[PDB]
Design an enzyme around this catalytic site. Structure first.
Site, PDB file in Angstrom:
ATOM      1  N   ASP B 151     -23.646  53.916  10.389  1.00 26.08           N
ATOM      2  CA  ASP B 151     -24.776  53.941   9.504  1.00 26.08           C
ATOM      3  C   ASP B 151     -25.922  53.016   9.969  1.00 26.08           C
ATOM      4  O   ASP B 151     -26.487  52.254   9.191  1.00 26.08           O
ATOM      5  CB  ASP B 151     -24.280  53.631   8.087  1.00 26.08           C
ATOM      6  CG  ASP B 151     -25.213  54.143   7.018  1.00 26.08           C
ATOM      7  OD1 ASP B 151     -26.252  54.796   7.354  1.00 26.08           O
ATOM      8  OD2 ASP B 151     -24.898  53.875   5.832  1.00 26.08           O
ATOM      9  N   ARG B 155     -33.061  50.507   7.077  1.00 24.78           N
ATOM     10  CA  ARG B 155     -32.677  50.064   5.714  1.00 24.78           C
ATOM     11  C   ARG B 155     -31.391  49.209   5.676  1.00 24.78           C
ATOM     12  O   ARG B 155     -31.166  48.434   4.729  1.00 24.78           O
ATOM     13  CB  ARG B 155     -32.634  51.257   4.715  1.00 24.78           C
ATOM     14  CG  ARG B 155     -31.330  52.062   4.662  1.00 24.78           C
ATOM     15  CD  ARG B 155     -31.491  53.618   4.484  1.00 24.78           C
ATOM     16  NE  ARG B 155     -30.246  54.219   4.983  1.00 24.78           N
ATOM     17  CZ  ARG B 155     -30.113  55.164   5.922  1.00 24.78           C
ATOM     18  NH1 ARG B 155     -31.152  55.768   6.480  1.00 24.78           N
ATOM     19  NH2 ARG B 155     -28.886  55.539   6.274  1.00 24.78           N
ATOM     20  N   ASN B 156     -30.582  49.345   6.731  1.00 26.84           N
ATOM     21  CA  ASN B 156     -29.320  48.603   6.930  1.00 26.84           C
ATOM     22  C   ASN B 156     -29.390  47.386   7.881  1.00 26.84           C
ATOM     23  O   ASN B 156     -28.366  46.772   8.189  1.00 26.84           O
ATOM     24  CB  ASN B 156     -28.220  49.560   7.384  1.00 26.84           C
ATOM     25  CG  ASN B 156     -27.959  50.676   6.364  1.00 26.84           C
ATOM     26  OD1 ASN B 156     -27.587  51.782   6.738  1.00 26.84           O
ATOM     27  ND2 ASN B 156     -28.159  50.386   5.082  1.00 26.84           N
ATOM     28  N   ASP B 169     -24.364  46.623   5.814  1.00 26.04           N
ATOM     29  CA  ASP B 169     -23.668  47.803   5.300  1.00 26.04           C
ATOM     30  C   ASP B 169     -22.523  48.258   6.207  1.00 26.04           C
ATOM     31  O   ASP B 169     -22.720  49.096   7.073  1.00 26.04           O
ATOM     32  CB  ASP B 169     -24.659  48.926   4.991  1.00 26.04           C
ATOM     33  CG  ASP B 169     -25.668  48.538   3.900  1.00 26.04           C
ATOM     34  OD1 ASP B 169     -26.447  47.572   4.114  1.00 26.04           O
ATOM     35  OD2 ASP B 169     -25.695  49.208   2.833  1.00 26.04           O
TER      36      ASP B 169
HETATM   37  C1  LIG Z   1     -34.629  39.447  -0.551  1.00 24.81           C
HETATM   38  C2  LIG Z   1     -33.752  40.688  -0.282  1.00 24.81           C
HETATM   39  C3  LIG Z   1     -34.177  41.947  -0.475  1.00 24.81           C
HETATM   40  C4  LIG Z   1     -33.143  42.728  -0.133  1.00 24.81           C
HETATM   41  C5  LIG Z   1     -33.172  44.288  -0.201  1.00 24.81           C
HETATM   42  C6  LIG Z   1     -32.052  41.923   0.276  1.00 24.81           C
HETATM   43  C7  LIG Z   1     -30.830  42.516   0.662  1.00 24.81           C
HETATM   44  C8  LIG Z   1     -29.660  41.891   1.135  1.00 24.81           C
HETATM   45  C9  LIG Z   1     -29.440  40.519   1.382  1.00 24.81           C
HETATM   46  O1  LIG Z   1     -30.252  39.601   1.223  1.00 24.81           O
HETATM   47  N1  LIG Z   1     -28.192  40.333   1.837  1.00 24.81           N
HETATM   48  C10 LIG Z   1     -27.574  41.536   1.901  1.00 24.81           C
HETATM   49  C11 LIG Z   1     -26.276  41.870   2.313  1.00 24.81           C
HETATM   50  C12 LIG Z   1     -25.840  43.189   2.305  1.00 24.81           C
HETATM   51  C13 LIG Z   1     -26.701  44.219   1.888  1.00 24.81           C
HETATM   52  N2  LIG Z   1     -26.195  45.493   1.918  1.00 24.81           N
HETATM   53  C14 LIG Z   1     -28.024  43.910   1.453  1.00 24.81           C
HETATM   54  C15 LIG Z   1     -28.460  42.563   1.467  1.00 24.81           C
HETATM   55  N3  LIG Z   1     -32.480  40.654   0.167  1.00 24.81           N
END
Ligand SMILES: Cc1cc(C)c(/C=C2\C(=O)Nc3ccc(N)cc32)[nH]1
Ligand SMILES: Cc1cc(C)c(/C=C2\C(=O)Nc3ccc(N)cc32)[nH]1
Lengths: 290, 290
Positions: B151, B155-156, B169
């Site tokens: 994947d 976005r990942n 992910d």
């Molecule tokens: C400030 C911030 C925005 C976002 C989408 C994140 C996303 C994550 C993040 O900060 N750590 C993560 C670990 C695993 C996954 N699948 C997503 C995240 N942090």
């Protein structure tokens, strides 16, 4: 693979509708693979003028699984016709993205309809029995067609004009004219708390697991769209189920109504009622209210 | 079934963290089975005081598939350690819902980071090459551990303090120490437009399909988070791919950079670069910029 074949077979007239006669509007919700938008259709299967419809399509970044689901739904709805099952009017597959053009239910999902409500939108116990019976009639018809629905829940029942129940989301339905069960090797995509004990543990789906789900839907109906097994994580369900536990009698629920729920949740699938008995039971409750 | 075993085995200390020392906050996003919330953790693995973390859990009405995915992710992250792979700190599995406590990346997802940006947040072509190289280093490490990620997409990938790339992910990652491929019988849940031609058609995943995805991610990087195959429905991909077509050279993209993308998309998996060559190629681009 199985999907490339399905996509090529498909891509090569009673159901085909011209894209340029369909106009899309607001999103109504995100389903079990799909997006549903409100739409309007011009000169749709002999209706002169525009008809307000709903359109099922793929979300952004759709996977093989979702696409197969959409094609599967389309293939089930072609064969299916009942006043309490959502009606299919066509598809657009030639100019752009695959769109299924289906019946619009004015009140949205049953969950949403029930959660806007109170007891006595003011709904009686007769109204709730009525909803459950219509759904049960739809299920008996599908069971007679040899189809397991697999995903029976309040969020998948729609409420049409005149408060008519429509069974929807056929993405996951399977044909069982042959072995009378559908067995899935990998893990299912149906919410854990709506699944029969044998579906959860042994991956077996039958009309008898639809009955289990129906019993969970009954609980949702009676609680006006409550959340099943509230505050219990899905992972606890393996052990809670196999050691004999079930959701307790909810409030505003007769002894007989709770008895019907428990019966749908019997561990042994053959000791559960068939949809014909469920309809019989609910009819009997309706008429004794007065 | 396979999951009830996994749930019981699991449910019976280096990774276990007390629930009462974790405080949950706002949602950050919805992943490929999971919800990620911002959180704070007290006395987390030898750090005195609170540490800002991210917490992965199940959404409402989680299915068997999502739960297995979450347990799978947890089992991969235990084995995995690299400055460009998201770091796992623990889990809460005893008091309530399964929660994975992971590294917080301050800038969110790479897609989101790139889409807030311009060219010259003002980003150079060196910054974009840098991002791609860090990701490639992470992938070479995972490829060395015998793990297909499956994947790989913008976005990942997360963006941590100091603009450090973190591959995330792991719900869908598979062990391939044995047959050097992971073969899935049913349909995958990875977005169609990020999948190698053999994964789409023959359900085969290898480090060489991760390379394909990486090439798609490269395109996302170079276009500052553009949408792959824009305005082409996923169902058109079977035919578009098998008849030899690929996304065209995007704007703001050197000849050599586009050559690397195409090479990742070679039909024959053995003619694609391995991540070591990709890192070599990107290094070589970095230093010739000046
Ligand atoms: C400030 C911030 C925005 C976002 C989408 C994140 C996303 C994550 C993040 O900060 N750590 C993560 C670990 C695993 C996954 N699948 C997503 C995240 N942090
Ligand atoms: C006014 C309104 C709200 C909602 C959620 C709907 C949903 C549907 C609707 O009106 N028709 C539908 C057919 C299939 C599915 N899966 C959903 C719908 N309509």
């Amino acid at each position: 693979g199985p999907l490339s074949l399905s996509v090529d077979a498909f891509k090569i007239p009673k159901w085909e509708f011209p894209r340029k006669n369909l106009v899309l509007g607001k999103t109504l919700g995100e389903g079990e693979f799909g997006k549903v938008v409100k739409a309007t259709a011009f000169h749709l299967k002999g209706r002169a003028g525009y008809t307000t419809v709903a359109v099922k399509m793929l979300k952004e970044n759709a996977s093989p699984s979702e696409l197969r689901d959409l094609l599967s739904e389309f293939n089930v709805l072609k064969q299916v016709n009942h006043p309490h099952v959502i009606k299919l009017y066509g598809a657009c597959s030639q100019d752009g993205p695959l769109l299924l053009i289906v019946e619009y239910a004015k009140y949205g999902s049953l969950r949403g309809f029930l959660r806007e409500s109170r007891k006595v939108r003011a709904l009686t116990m007769g109204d709730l029995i009525s909803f459950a019976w219509q759904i049960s009639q739809g299920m008996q018809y599908l069971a007679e067609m040899k189809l397991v629905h697999r995903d029976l829940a309040a969020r998948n029942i729609l409420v049409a004009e005149g408060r008519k129940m429509k069974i929807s989301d056929f993405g996951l339905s399977r044909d069982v004219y042959e072995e009378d069960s559908y067995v899935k090797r990998s893990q299912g995509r149906i919410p854990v708390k709506w699944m029969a004990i044998e579906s959860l543990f042994d991956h077996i789906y039958t009309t008898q697991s639809d009955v289990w789900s129906f019993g969970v839907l009954l609980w949702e109906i009676v609680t006006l769209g409550g959340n099943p097994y509230p505050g219990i994580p899905p992972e606890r369900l393996f052990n809670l189920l196999k050691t004999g536990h079930r959701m307790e009698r909810p409030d505003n629920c007769s002894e007989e109504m709770y008895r019907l729920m428990l019966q749908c949740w019997k561990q042994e699938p053959d000791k559960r009622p068939v949809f014909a008995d469920i309809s019989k039971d609910l009819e009997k409750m309706m008429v004794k209210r007065r």
